[PDB]
Amino acid sequence: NGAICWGPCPTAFRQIGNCGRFRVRCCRIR
DSSP states (O other), rough: OOOOOOOOOOOOHHHHHHHHOOHHHHHHHH
C-alpha cells in the first residue's frame, strides 16, 4: 500500500497523478 500499486503499468495511478489543469503559460508570465 502507498504510491506503488505493484502493477506493470498502473492506469489508475496515472488518472490520479494528473495536474494538467495547471496553466503553464499563465504561471510562466505570472
